[PDB]
Amino acid sequence: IQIKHSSLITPLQAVAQRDPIIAKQLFSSLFSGILKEMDKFKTLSEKNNITQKLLQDFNRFLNTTFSFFPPFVSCIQDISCQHAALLSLDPAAVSAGCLASLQQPVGIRLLEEALLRPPDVLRWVELAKLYRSIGEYDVLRGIFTSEIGTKQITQSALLAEARSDYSEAAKQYDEALNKQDWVDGEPTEAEKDFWELASLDCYNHLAEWKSLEYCSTASIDSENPPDLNKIWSEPFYQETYLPYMIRSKLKLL
């Protein structure tokens, strides 16, 4: 045991060069150790520009990757969990990378550590995406009852949706997505996009196919004619409205 560093350092980089998982662990632990040692040298401001430029680096990474490597994506989202400068990464790119790479636990953990310690509600909507993708409708319904839903009709539809009364939930979502005489303020864009998406879920859950197909195309650019072409524009449309469109028209056909 009276051996030196090189017999530990060179085979470590030699095996981390070949296998990507141990490369992920090594890059994460070395990065976190260096940033932990930055407590002594950089003090108040040069530290803060260092971590701001690291956040710049990582946001550029997650926006411009196109192959989605799981060790790389999870490694740069795993070093964002420990240091509170990089918790504010981007809730859009995190959810896109975790849906594309099949790593929703890592995005869920990062967004949770962000909601610990607007960019409040943005992370809630992009956390409901990751929880919807892996089943988990109980936790997603727990999100919409507390932090996203403001109005009362949202909670009264969440109850009737939870007790499997999907007609008396879609009726309230239709009754909320046409209200103009809102007395106490307006819904947000998040609170209205939830009502649209959950009305689609209720119409799919019942069986109502002549209503599901119309509601699944009458929010893209189609006012008087149904112009199906616009689903390739605005890529969120082909992730949110496309399967309901095709399933509804197919069950009709």
Short mmCIF file of C-alpha atoms in Angstrom, two decimals:
data_model
loop_
_atom_site.label_atom_id
_atom_site.label_comp_id
_atom_site.label_asym_id
_atom_site.label_seq_id
_atom_site.Cartn_x
_atom_site.Cartn_y
_atom_site.Cartn_z
CA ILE A 1 0.00 0.00 0.00
CA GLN A 2 3.07 2.23 -0.19
CA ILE A 3 2.26 3.00 -3.85
CA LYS A 4 2.00 6.35 -5.65
CA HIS A 5 -0.57 8.41 -7.50
CA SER A 6 0.15 7.44 -11.10
CA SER A 7 -1.01 3.84 -10.66
CA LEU A 8 -4.36 5.30 -9.59
CA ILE A 9 -4.61 8.31 -11.92
CA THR A 10 -3.59 6.85 -15.28
CA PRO A 11 -5.74 3.66 -15.24
CA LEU A 12 -8.69 5.76 -14.04
CA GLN A 13 -8.53 8.01 -17.08
CA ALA A 14 -7.68 4.95 -19.19
CA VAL A 15 -10.92 3.19 -18.27
CA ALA A 16 -12.97 6.41 -18.22
CA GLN A 17 -11.88 6.98 -21.79
CA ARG A 18 -13.55 3.75 -22.91
CA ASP A 19 -16.72 3.38 -20.82
CA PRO A 20 -19.18 6.27 -20.78
CA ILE A 21 -20.82 5.60 -17.41
CA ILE A 22 -17.59 5.83 -15.46
CA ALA A 23 -16.78 8.90 -17.55
CA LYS A 24 -20.06 10.45 -16.36
CA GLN A 25 -19.24 9.69 -12.73
CA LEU A 26 -15.68 10.98 -13.09
CA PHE A 27 -16.65 14.25 -14.80
CA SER A 28 -19.39 14.89 -12.24
CA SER A 29 -17.19 14.19 -9.22
CA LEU A 30 -14.21 16.17 -10.56
CA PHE A 31 -16.44 19.12 -11.52
CA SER A 32 -18.15 19.17 -8.14
CA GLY A 33 -14.83 18.87 -6.33
CA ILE A 34 -13.24 21.77 -8.22
CA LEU A 35 -16.30 23.95 -7.58
CA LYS A 36 -16.14 22.95 -3.91
CA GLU A 37 -12.51 24.04 -3.80
CA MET A 38 -13.50 27.40 -5.34
CA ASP A 39 -14.58 28.48 -1.78
CA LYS A 40 -11.05 29.74 -1.06
CA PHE A 41 -9.87 31.52 -4.19
CA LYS A 42 -12.87 33.24 -5.73
CA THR A 43 -14.78 35.22 -3.15
CA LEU A 44 -17.86 37.26 -4.09
CA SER A 45 -17.93 38.40 -7.71
CA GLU A 46 -15.37 36.55 -9.80
CA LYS A 47 -17.01 33.40 -8.39
CA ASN A 48 -20.38 34.67 -9.49
CA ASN A 49 -19.19 35.37 -13.02
CA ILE A 50 -17.59 31.90 -13.07
CA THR A 51 -20.88 30.25 -12.16
CA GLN A 52 -22.82 32.55 -14.47
CA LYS A 53 -20.57 31.55 -17.35
CA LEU A 54 -20.96 27.89 -16.42
CA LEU A 55 -24.72 28.37 -16.53
CA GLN A 56 -24.23 29.98 -19.94
CA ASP A 57 -22.23 26.94 -21.05
CA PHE A 58 -24.80 24.42 -19.86
CA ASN A 59 -27.79 26.26 -21.29
CA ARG A 60 -26.03 26.43 -24.64
CA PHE A 61 -25.33 22.67 -24.32
CA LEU A 62 -28.92 21.70 -23.65
CA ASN A 63 -30.25 23.97 -26.33
CA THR A 64 -27.94 22.89 -29.15
CA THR A 65 -27.42 19.16 -28.71
CA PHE A 66 -29.28 17.04 -31.25
CA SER A 67 -28.05 13.57 -30.54
CA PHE A 68 -29.13 12.94 -26.98
CA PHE A 69 -26.54 10.97 -25.13
CA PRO A 70 -27.86 9.69 -21.80
CA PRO A 71 -24.56 9.86 -19.84
CA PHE A 72 -23.82 13.35 -21.12
CA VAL A 73 -27.34 14.74 -20.60
CA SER A 74 -27.69 13.17 -17.17
CA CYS A 75 -24.18 14.26 -16.18
CA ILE A 76 -24.73 17.92 -16.92
CA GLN A 77 -28.12 17.71 -15.23
CA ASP A 78 -26.61 15.87 -12.26
CA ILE A 79 -23.99 18.51 -11.53
CA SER A 80 -26.75 21.12 -11.68
CA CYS A 81 -28.45 19.51 -8.68
CA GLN A 82 -25.78 20.21 -6.09
CA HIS A 83 -24.72 23.83 -6.63
CA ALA A 84 -27.46 26.40 -6.16
CA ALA A 85 -26.02 28.75 -8.77
CA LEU A 86 -26.88 26.30 -11.55
CA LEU A 87 -30.33 25.28 -10.30
CA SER A 88 -31.87 27.95 -12.52
CA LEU A 89 -30.74 26.16 -15.65
CA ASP A 90 -33.69 26.19 -18.01
CA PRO A 91 -36.94 24.35 -17.36
CA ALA A 92 -37.66 24.20 -21.09
CA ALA A 93 -34.42 22.58 -22.22
CA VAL A 94 -34.34 20.24 -19.22
CA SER A 95 -37.76 18.79 -20.03
CA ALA A 96 -36.98 18.59 -23.74
CA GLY A 97 -33.71 16.77 -23.11
CA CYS A 98 -35.25 14.39 -20.61
CA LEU A 99 -38.20 13.56 -22.84
CA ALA A 100 -35.86 13.07 -25.80
CA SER A 101 -33.23 11.06 -23.95
CA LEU A 102 -35.58 9.07 -21.64
CA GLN A 103 -34.15 10.45 -18.39
CA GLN A 104 -37.19 11.94 -16.67
CA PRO A 105 -35.96 11.10 -13.12
CA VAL A 106 -32.99 13.44 -13.56
CA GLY A 107 -35.09 16.32 -14.81
CA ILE A 108 -37.62 15.66 -12.05
CA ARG A 109 -34.90 15.77 -9.41
CA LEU A 110 -33.35 18.95 -10.81
CA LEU A 111 -36.67 20.75 -11.12
CA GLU A 112 -37.57 19.65 -7.59
CA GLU A 113 -34.33 21.08 -6.21
CA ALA A 114 -35.12 24.25 -8.13
CA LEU A 115 -38.59 24.50 -6.57
CA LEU A 116 -36.86 24.20 -3.22
CA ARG A 117 -34.49 26.96 -1.86
CA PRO A 118 -42.40 33.63 -13.60
CA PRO A 119 -39.60 31.10 -13.13
CA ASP A 120 -41.76 29.63 -10.38
CA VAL A 121 -44.74 28.54 -12.49
CA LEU A 122 -42.58 27.73 -15.51
CA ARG A 123 -40.81 25.00 -13.58
CA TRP A 124 -44.15 23.69 -12.31
CA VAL A 125 -45.52 23.29 -15.85
CA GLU A 126 -42.30 21.68 -17.00
CA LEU A 127 -42.45 19.37 -13.97
CA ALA A 128 -46.00 18.32 -14.77
CA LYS A 129 -44.71 17.35 -18.22
CA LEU A 130 -42.11 14.96 -16.80
CA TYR A 131 -44.57 13.50 -14.29
CA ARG A 132 -47.19 13.01 -17.01
CA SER A 133 -44.71 11.16 -19.19
CA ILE A 134 -44.06 8.38 -16.65
CA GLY A 135 -47.63 7.71 -15.59
CA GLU A 136 -47.91 9.33 -12.16
CA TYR A 137 -51.24 11.07 -12.54
CA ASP A 138 -51.67 11.34 -8.77
CA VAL A 139 -48.67 13.62 -8.36
CA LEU A 140 -49.60 15.64 -11.44
CA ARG A 141 -53.10 16.12 -10.10
CA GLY A 142 -51.53 17.18 -6.82
CA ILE A 143 -49.59 19.86 -8.69
CA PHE A 144 -52.64 21.37 -10.37
CA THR A 145 -54.55 21.59 -7.07
CA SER A 146 -51.94 23.67 -5.29
CA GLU A 147 -49.51 25.70 -7.31
CA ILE A 148 -50.81 26.00 -10.85
CA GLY A 149 -54.57 26.25 -10.42
CA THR A 150 -55.78 29.62 -9.15
CA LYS A 151 -59.52 29.56 -9.79
CA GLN A 152 -62.10 27.42 -7.98
CA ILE A 153 -63.54 25.68 -11.01
CA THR A 154 -60.17 24.02 -11.55
CA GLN A 155 -60.36 22.38 -8.13
CA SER A 156 -64.01 21.46 -8.60
CA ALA A 157 -63.06 19.76 -11.85
CA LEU A 158 -60.02 18.08 -10.31
CA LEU A 159 -62.29 16.45 -7.71
CA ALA A 160 -64.78 15.18 -10.28
CA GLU A 161 -61.92 14.00 -12.47
CA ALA A 162 -60.36 12.10 -9.58
CA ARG A 163 -63.59 10.31 -8.71
CA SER A 164 -63.97 9.21 -12.38
CA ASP A 165 -66.80 11.50 -13.43
CA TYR A 166 -65.30 12.62 -16.71
CA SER A 167 -68.49 14.13 -18.12
CA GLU A 168 -68.90 16.46 -15.13
CA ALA A 169 -65.25 17.48 -15.52
CA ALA A 170 -65.27 18.18 -19.25
CA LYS A 171 -68.45 20.19 -18.73
CA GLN A 172 -66.66 22.41 -16.23
CA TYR A 173 -63.61 22.77 -18.44
CA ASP A 174 -65.87 23.87 -21.28
CA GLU A 175 -67.62 26.19 -18.82
CA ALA A 176 -64.26 27.70 -17.85
CA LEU A 177 -62.80 28.01 -21.35
CA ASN A 178 -65.49 30.44 -22.48
CA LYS A 179 -65.93 32.66 -19.43
CA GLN A 180 -65.43 36.35 -20.16
CA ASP A 181 -67.05 37.85 -17.05
CA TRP A 182 -64.26 36.74 -14.77
CA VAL A 183 -64.88 38.68 -11.58
CA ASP A 184 -61.68 38.12 -9.61
CA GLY A 185 -58.97 38.47 -12.22
CA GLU A 186 -57.85 36.33 -15.08
CA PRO A 187 -56.36 32.87 -15.41
CA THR A 188 -52.76 32.60 -16.44
CA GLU A 189 -51.62 31.04 -19.68
CA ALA A 190 -50.62 27.98 -17.65
CA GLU A 191 -54.02 27.71 -16.00
CA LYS A 192 -55.78 27.94 -19.37
CA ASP A 193 -53.45 25.53 -21.17
CA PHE A 194 -54.15 23.02 -18.43
CA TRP A 195 -57.90 23.39 -18.98
CA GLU A 196 -57.48 22.78 -22.70
CA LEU A 197 -55.27 19.71 -22.22
CA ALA A 198 -57.42 18.21 -19.49
CA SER A 199 -60.54 18.76 -21.58
CA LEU A 200 -58.80 16.71 -24.26
CA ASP A 201 -58.08 14.02 -21.67
CA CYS A 202 -61.71 13.96 -20.50
CA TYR A 203 -63.05 13.72 -24.04
CA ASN A 204 -60.60 10.91 -24.76
CA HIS A 205 -61.52 9.20 -21.52
CA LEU A 206 -65.20 9.19 -22.19
CA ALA A 207 -65.44 8.21 -25.81
CA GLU A 208 -66.68 11.37 -27.40
CA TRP A 209 -65.03 11.36 -30.80
CA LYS A 210 -66.84 14.12 -32.65
CA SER A 211 -65.89 16.47 -29.81
CA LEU A 212 -62.33 15.24 -29.30
CA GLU A 213 -61.27 15.76 -32.91
CA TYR A 214 -62.78 19.26 -33.06
CA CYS A 215 -61.21 20.34 -29.78
CA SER A 216 -57.88 18.80 -30.81
CA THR A 217 -57.62 20.91 -33.97
CA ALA A 218 -59.37 24.10 -32.97
CA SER A 219 -56.39 25.64 -31.25
CA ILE A 220 -53.55 25.58 -33.81
CA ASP A 221 -54.41 28.11 -36.51
CA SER A 222 -57.77 26.65 -37.59
CA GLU A 223 -60.60 29.13 -37.09
CA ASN A 224 -63.29 28.47 -39.73
CA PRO A 225 -61.59 25.71 -41.79
CA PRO A 226 -59.71 22.89 -40.08
CA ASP A 227 -56.18 23.48 -41.36
CA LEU A 228 -54.28 20.38 -40.26
CA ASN A 229 -51.00 21.58 -41.79
CA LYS A 230 -49.96 23.80 -38.91
CA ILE A 231 -49.11 20.88 -36.62
CA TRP A 232 -45.67 20.60 -38.19
CA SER A 233 -45.11 24.24 -37.40
CA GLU A 234 -44.80 24.96 -33.64
CA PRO A 235 -43.22 21.64 -32.53
CA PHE A 236 -45.14 21.62 -29.22
CA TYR A 237 -48.25 20.94 -31.31
CA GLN A 238 -46.97 17.63 -32.58
CA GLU A 239 -46.20 16.54 -29.00
CA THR A 240 -49.46 17.71 -27.44
CA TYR A 241 -52.25 17.80 -30.03
CA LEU A 242 -51.08 15.27 -32.62
CA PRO A 243 -51.91 11.91 -30.90
CA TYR A 244 -55.37 13.05 -29.91
CA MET A 245 -55.98 14.29 -33.46
CA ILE A 246 -54.94 11.02 -35.07
CA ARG A 247 -56.63 8.80 -32.46
CA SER A 248 -59.89 10.75 -32.63
CA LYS A 249 -60.09 10.82 -36.42
CA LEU A 250 -59.11 7.16 -36.59
CA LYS A 251 -61.76 6.04 -34.09
CA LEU A 252 -64.25 8.04 -36.13
CA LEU A 253 -63.08 6.39 -39.33
#
